[PDB]
Design an enzyme around this catalytic site. Structure first.
Site, PDB file in Angstrom:
ATOM      1  N   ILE A   1      55.662   2.515 -16.516  1.00 12.60           N
ATOM      2  CA  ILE A   1      55.639   1.584 -17.633  1.00 12.60           C
ATOM      3  C   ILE A   1      54.424   1.783 -18.534  1.00 12.60           C
ATOM      4  O   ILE A   1      54.530   1.704 -19.756  1.00 12.60           O
ATOM      5  CB  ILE A   1      55.745   0.157 -17.047  1.00 12.60           C
ATOM      6  CG1 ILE A   1      57.087  -0.006 -16.310  1.00 12.60           C
ATOM      7  CG2 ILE A   1      55.523  -0.937 -18.095  1.00 12.60           C
ATOM      8  CD1 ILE A   1      58.338   0.276 -17.173  1.00 12.60           C
ATOM      9  N   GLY A   2      53.287   2.066 -17.926  1.00 15.26           N
ATOM     10  CA  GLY A   2      52.060   2.274 -18.669  1.00 15.26           C
ATOM     11  C   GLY A   2      51.016   2.993 -17.854  1.00 15.26           C
ATOM     12  O   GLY A   2      51.034   2.948 -16.627  1.00 15.26           O
TER      13      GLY A   2
ATOM     14  N   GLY B   1      46.701   3.901 -18.051  1.00 15.20           N
ATOM     15  CA  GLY B   1      45.395   3.751 -18.673  1.00 15.20           C
ATOM     16  C   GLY B   1      44.351   4.577 -17.956  1.00 15.20           C
ATOM     17  O   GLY B   1      44.674   5.330 -17.026  1.00 15.20           O
TER      18      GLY B   1
ATOM     19  N   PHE C   1      42.093   3.651 -15.848  1.00 16.85           N
ATOM     20  CA  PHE C   1      41.926   3.324 -14.435  1.00 16.85           C
ATOM     21  C   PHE C   1      43.120   2.602 -13.814  1.00 16.85           C
ATOM     22  O   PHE C   1      42.947   1.621 -13.086  1.00 16.85           O
ATOM     23  CB  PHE C   1      40.613   2.560 -14.190  1.00 16.85           C
ATOM     24  CG  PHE C   1      39.394   3.464 -14.230  1.00 16.85           C
ATOM     25  CD1 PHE C   1      39.267   4.530 -13.351  1.00 16.85           C
ATOM     26  CD2 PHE C   1      38.379   3.247 -15.147  1.00 16.85           C
ATOM     27  CE1 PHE C   1      38.153   5.361 -13.393  1.00 16.85           C
ATOM     28  CE2 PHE C   1      37.264   4.079 -15.182  1.00 16.85           C
ATOM     29  CZ  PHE C   1      37.162   5.134 -14.313  1.00 16.85           C
ATOM     30  N   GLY C   2      44.312   3.147 -14.028  1.00 17.68           N
ATOM     31  CA  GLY C   2      45.516   2.563 -13.454  1.00 17.68           C
ATOM     32  C   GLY C   2      46.830   2.943 -14.099  1.00 17.68           C
ATOM     33  O   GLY C   2      46.929   3.073 -15.317  1.00 17.68           O
ATOM     34  N   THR C   3      47.857   3.106 -13.275  1.00 14.34           N
ATOM     35  CA  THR C   3      49.194   3.403 -13.749  1.00 14.34           C
ATOM     36  C   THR C   3      50.156   2.332 -13.209  1.00 14.34           C
ATOM     37  O   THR C   3      50.267   2.153 -12.001  1.00 14.34           O
ATOM     38  CB  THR C   3      49.619   4.810 -13.324  1.00 14.34           C
ATOM     39  OG1 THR C   3      48.592   5.745 -13.649  1.00 14.34           O
ATOM     40  CG2 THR C   3      50.898   5.245 -13.988  1.00 14.34           C
ATOM     41  N   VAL C   4      50.836   1.615 -14.102  1.00 14.39           N
ATOM     42  CA  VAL C   4      51.807   0.603 -13.708  1.00 14.39           C
ATOM     43  C   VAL C   4      53.227   1.199 -13.671  1.00 14.39           C
ATOM     44  O   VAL C   4      53.596   2.006 -14.516  1.00 14.39           O
ATOM     45  CB  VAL C   4      51.695  -0.684 -14.569  1.00 14.39           C
ATOM     46  CG1 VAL C   4      52.771  -1.700 -14.201  1.00 14.39           C
ATOM     47  CG2 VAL C   4      50.312  -1.303 -14.434  1.00 14.39           C
TER      48      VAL C   4
ATOM     49  N   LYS D   1      50.964  -1.530  -9.418  1.00 18.76           N
ATOM     50  CA  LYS D   1      49.789  -0.990 -10.079  1.00 18.76           C
ATOM     51  C   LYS D   1      49.164   0.001  -9.131  1.00 18.76           C
ATOM     52  O   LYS D   1      48.737  -0.386  -8.052  1.00 18.76           O
ATOM     53  CB  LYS D   1      48.794  -2.107 -10.342  1.00 18.76           C
ATOM     54  CG  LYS D   1      47.644  -1.702 -11.217  1.00 18.76           C
ATOM     55  CD  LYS D   1      46.652  -2.826 -11.276  1.00 18.76           C
ATOM     56  CE  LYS D   1      45.665  -2.581 -12.367  1.00 18.76           C
ATOM     57  NZ  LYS D   1      44.672  -3.672 -12.435  1.00 18.76           N
TER      58      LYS D   1
ATOM     59  N   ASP E   1      39.491 -11.805 -20.133  1.00 19.01           N
ATOM     60  CA  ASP E   1      40.234 -10.936 -21.035  1.00 19.01           C
ATOM     61  C   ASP E   1      41.482 -11.647 -21.551  1.00 19.01           C
ATOM     62  O   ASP E   1      42.537 -11.024 -21.669  1.00 19.01           O
ATOM     63  CB  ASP E   1      40.606  -9.617 -20.332  1.00 19.01           C
ATOM     64  CG  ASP E   1      40.846  -8.440 -21.267  1.00 19.01           C
ATOM     65  OD1 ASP E   1      40.529  -8.563 -22.476  1.00 19.01           O
ATOM     66  OD2 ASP E   1      41.336  -7.388 -20.785  1.00 19.01           O
TER      67      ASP E   1
HETATM   68  C1  LIG Z   1      51.229  -4.629 -11.159  1.00 22.40           C
HETATM   69  C2  LIG Z   1      50.008  -5.445 -11.528  1.00 22.40           C
HETATM   70  C3  LIG Z   1      49.008  -5.563 -10.581  1.00 22.40           C
HETATM   71  C4  LIG Z   1      47.887  -6.318 -10.871  1.00 22.40           C
HETATM   72  F1  LIG Z   1      46.930  -6.457  -9.934  1.00 22.40           F
HETATM   73  C5  LIG Z   1      47.769  -7.005 -12.077  1.00 22.40           C
HETATM   74  N1  LIG Z   1      46.596  -7.753 -12.237  1.00 22.40           N
HETATM   75  C6  LIG Z   1      46.516  -9.007 -12.716  1.00 22.40           C
HETATM   76  O1  LIG Z   1      47.479  -9.624 -13.139  1.00 22.40           O
HETATM   77  C7  LIG Z   1      45.207  -9.675 -12.769  1.00 22.40           C
HETATM   78  C8  LIG Z   1      44.026  -8.998 -12.460  1.00 22.40           C
HETATM   79  C9  LIG Z   1      42.816  -9.654 -12.513  1.00 22.40           C
HETATM   80  C10 LIG Z   1      42.795 -10.997 -12.864  1.00 22.40           C
HETATM   81  C11 LIG Z   1      43.966 -11.682 -13.177  1.00 22.40           C
HETATM   82  C12 LIG Z   1      43.972 -13.148 -13.539  1.00 22.40           C
HETATM   83  C13 LIG Z   1      44.203 -13.943 -12.249  1.00 22.40           C
HETATM   84  C14 LIG Z   1      42.657 -13.585 -14.209  1.00 22.40           C
HETATM   85  C15 LIG Z   1      45.095 -13.437 -14.447  1.00 22.40           C
HETATM   86  N2  LIG Z   1      45.959 -13.657 -15.151  1.00 22.40           N
HETATM   87  C16 LIG Z   1      45.175 -11.027 -13.121  1.00 22.40           C
HETATM   88  C17 LIG Z   1      48.771  -6.899 -13.041  1.00 22.40           C
HETATM   89  C18 LIG Z   1      49.921  -6.153 -12.748  1.00 22.40           C
HETATM   90  C19 LIG Z   1      50.994  -5.959 -13.762  1.00 22.40           C
HETATM   91  C20 LIG Z   1      50.804  -4.998 -14.762  1.00 22.40           C
HETATM   92  N3  LIG Z   1      51.736  -4.746 -15.645  1.00 22.40           N
HETATM   93  C21 LIG Z   1      52.930  -5.345 -15.591  1.00 22.40           C
HETATM   94  C22 LIG Z   1      53.999  -5.049 -16.571  1.00 22.40           C
HETATM   95  O2  LIG Z   1      53.823  -4.200 -17.423  1.00 22.40           O
HETATM   96  N4  LIG Z   1      55.176  -5.708 -16.482  1.00 22.40           N
HETATM   97  C23 LIG Z   1      56.236  -5.408 -17.442  1.00 22.40           C
HETATM   98  N5  LIG Z   1      55.420  -6.669 -15.494  1.00 22.40           N
HETATM   99  C24 LIG Z   1      54.523  -6.985 -14.605  1.00 22.40           C
HETATM  100  C25 LIG Z   1      53.215  -6.317 -14.602  1.00 22.40           C
HETATM  101  C26 LIG Z   1      52.218  -6.626 -13.678  1.00 22.40           C
END
Ligand SMILES: Cc1cc(F)c(NC(=O)c2cccc(C(C)(C)C#N)c2)cc1-c1cnc2c(=O)n(C)ncc2c1
Ligand SMILES: Cc1cc(F)c(NC(=O)c2cccc(C(C)(C)C#N)c2)cc1-c1cnc2c(=O)n(C)ncc2c1
Lengths: 258, 250
Positions: free
Chosen positions: B14-15, B17, B19-22, B34, B124
């Site tokens: 999906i994306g 960067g 420091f990370g690939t989703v 992630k 953020d």
């Molecule tokens: C997979 C993943 C793993 C993670 F660990 C985080 N990290 C956090 O959410 C995170 C980190 C630090 C603090 C916070 C707080 C609690 C402050 C908030 N809010 C939140 C986000 C994702 C993520 C990325 N992308 C997508 C996406 O593209 N789609 C379409 N759907 C779901 C999706 C999910």
């Protein structure tokens, strides 16, 4: 730590009351549902229910948010707006499209598949316990207030139709699969099983002895062949002949794309 | 919450960067995974992120589902179907009704209010990090792998930590400006270093005259309080949420 201190939850409208609990709508950083349940039996049963909910982080499972001890034991979950599957099929008598019926079954199997991966047996899977929250997302919880939420049980009239033969004569992944097969029968027929039988004691005796099972000829004309076959496997008399939720979910997912 | 090796079917990227690939994936339904030899700095950063997400159980906050260590560090959350608030206002110029705009703000304030009650500073908050999942429920996460939402104190390179509840409130006020104007703040400025110099010295703030004609009076006043230069003059999320909840009923 999921304990919510005293004075944060604004307890509002009473939604339901049973022999072992009162559910209320409320406010706490948005909308919440609060279950108010003190004796040592109630204390062990409260901590058991908080311990099981604590293990669930899935979209198709009711979101546990917290709990309180003072001034009374309370379990805080997300608010579910809308109606249960039982209310849609049997009270509103709504006619969902086949696509929507297969999607509800898919979402229910995802939640049940997740529960069995976390070693959690529901023990009370029924259309009443499947919420069509916002009419799109399926939330599996245990919205019943007539029974105690303990590790095991020793007034189950609103659950008999989903009880497997061994559960009547016990609780395993296969008995949840049977209950799910009953839920599939409700989705595919729009009716509860055994509507012609006049007494609950006749269903208890006949289902228990294996001489009674839902009538798969009563299903909708547009019901898919894989769905008829899936219900039949989930409703088998021998629990070891019943499929597991990974296989159930993959059959519903292959059916939903076709 | 550890998910063993061989359960998650990692699918579509999906994306990606620095420091990370989703990835989209399957694990008892739809998931977002992630992915990050792993370095001790990255091991600490993985465990910090799993520790913060572990503390969140709210409908308006991205549902953390699990994590994996083998064969690589992974964080499993729910799948978010749809688009971010940034995509709806700025990429697709979707003109939502005022009721839908106030509802997004209400859902965002519920999630932020919950986060600050759990002693969690987002750091953020931006329209990119606000997902309009199923086009009805708002999911706050951190989908990044931000200057316009940085408070004057955050923008200044200080000897102290500038991140607080009030700096999230400022970022939220920026998000309110985006909902009420349909635009990002400071569109006339030609350089990022000019926003960095002017916002930091307190001589620059969003233009509240650019808001929609149908924007409510309480909303104009709310944005102004959230965008104050002095962070102690900014409202807290309980008061922000109750003002948006009062406004939504009117
Ligand atoms: C997979 C993943 C793993 C993670 F660990 C985080 N990290 C956090 O959410 C995170 C980190 C630090 C603090 C916070 C707080 C609690 C402050 C908030 N809010 C939140 C986000 C994702 C993520 C990325 N992308 C997508 C996406 O593209 N789609 C379409 N759907 C779901 C999706 C999910
Ligand atoms: C407040 C509350 C507190 C609880 F603790 C449970 N308990 C469980 O859900 C539960 C118990 C035992 C095992 C399980 C498992 C994990 C096996 C499942 N599934 C789940 C349910 C509710 C509850 C009741 N009513 C309503 C309602 O009426 N509306 C409209 N919306 C939400 C709502 C929420």
């Amino acid at each position: 730590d999921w304990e919510i201190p005293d004075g944060q939850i604004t307890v509002g409208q009473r939604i339901g009351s049973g022999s072992f609990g009162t559910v209320y709508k409320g406010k706490w950083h948005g909308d919440v549902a609060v279950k108010m349940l003190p004796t040592p039996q109630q204390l062990q049963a409260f901590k058991n229910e908080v311990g099981v909910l604590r293990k669930t982080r899935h979209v198709n499972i009711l979101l546990f948010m917290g709990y309180s001890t003072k001034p009374q034991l309370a379990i805080v979950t997300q608010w579910c707006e809308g109606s249960s599957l039982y209310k849609h099929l049997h009270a509103s008598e709504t006619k969902f499209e086949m696509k929507k019926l297969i999607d509800i079954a898919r979402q229910t199997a995802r939640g049940m598949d997740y529960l069995h991966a976390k070693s959690i047996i529901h023990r009370d899977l029924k259309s009443n316990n499947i919420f069509l929250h916002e009419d799109n997302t399926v939330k599996i919880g245990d919205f019943g207030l007539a029974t105690v939420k303990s590790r095991w049980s020793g007034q189950l009239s609103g659950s008999i139709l989903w009880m497997a033969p061994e559960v009547i004569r016990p609780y395993s992944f296969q008995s949840d699969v049977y209950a799910f097969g009953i839920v599939l029968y409700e989705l595919m027929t729009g009716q509860l099983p055994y509507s012609n039988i006049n007494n609950r004691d006749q269903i208890i005796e006949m289902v228990g002895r294996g001489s009674l099972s839902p009538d798969l000829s009563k299903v909708r004309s547009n019901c898919p062949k894989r769905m008829k076959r899936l219900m039949a496997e989930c409703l088998k008399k021998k629990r070891d002949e019943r499929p597991s939720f990974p296989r159930i979910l993959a059959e519903i997912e292959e059916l939903a794309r076709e």
